[PDB]
Design a binder for this molecule. Structure first.
Ligand SMILES: O=C(NO)[C@H]1CCCN1S(=O)(=O)CCc1ccccc1
Ligand SMILES: [Ca+2]
Ligand SMILES: [Ca+2]
Ligand SMILES: [Ca+2]
Ligand SMILES: [Zn+2]
Ligand SMILES: [Zn+2]
Length: 158
């Protein structure tokens, strides 16, 4: 289904997990948008008020779409594919402990997977792909998209 039909995309952070330093949320989501723009024609800018394309949300339990969070573990996060309104939005379970590192749940790695969803990608059956449906920590410092990921996103864009 959907793909954005424009090159300039905006995101807004709804609120911040108390799990992390503010700046570290900003940076993690920024780095995660850079992953996809590296391999597409898209450009991603953080606006701080009004309607973004992609709204980034921290929330627990019933948070008012249909995709209720399940407490700590299980479903870590979910996102909507492109489209108007809620399309694009990416939602992180505040019942997880979000981190900049190997501990709890790495927000960067998770945000990369969700932005893939915000962008029109589904899951991959490759355990090496960031779009594989099982969260596995890998060094974020040397993180690199799997070739499966690149083919899938370039299947939609560019
Ligand atoms: O895929 C998902 N969300 O987008 C949900 C539905 C089923 C598995 N998960 S998950 O949130 O638990 C983790 C998926 C994931 C994959 C790689 C990196 C982070 C998270
Ligand atoms: Ca959860
Ligand atoms: Ca939206
Ligand atoms: Ca938390
Ligand atoms: Zn949600
Ligand atoms: Zn997913």
């Amino acid at each position: 289904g959907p793909v954005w039909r424009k090159h300039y995309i905006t995101y807004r952070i709804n609120n911040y997990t108390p799990d992390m330093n503010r700046e570290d949320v900003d940076y993690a989501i920024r780095k995660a948008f850079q992953v996809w723009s590296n391999v597409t024609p898209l450009k991603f800018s953080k606006i701080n008020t009004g309607m973004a394309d992609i709204l980034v949300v921290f929330a627990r339990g019933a948070h008012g779409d249909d995709h209720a969070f399940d407490g700590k573990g299980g479903i870590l996060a979910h996102a909507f594919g492109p489209g108007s309104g809620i399309g694009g939005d990416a939602h992180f379970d505040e019942d997880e402990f979000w981190t900049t590192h190997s501990g709890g749940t790495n927000l960067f790695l998770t945000a990369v997977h969700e932005i893939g969803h915000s962008l029109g990608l589904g899951h991959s059956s490759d355990p090496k792909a960031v779009m594989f449906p099982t969260y596995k920590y890998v060094d974020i410092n040397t993180f690199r998209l799997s070739a499966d990921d690149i083919r899938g996103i370039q299947s939609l864009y560019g």
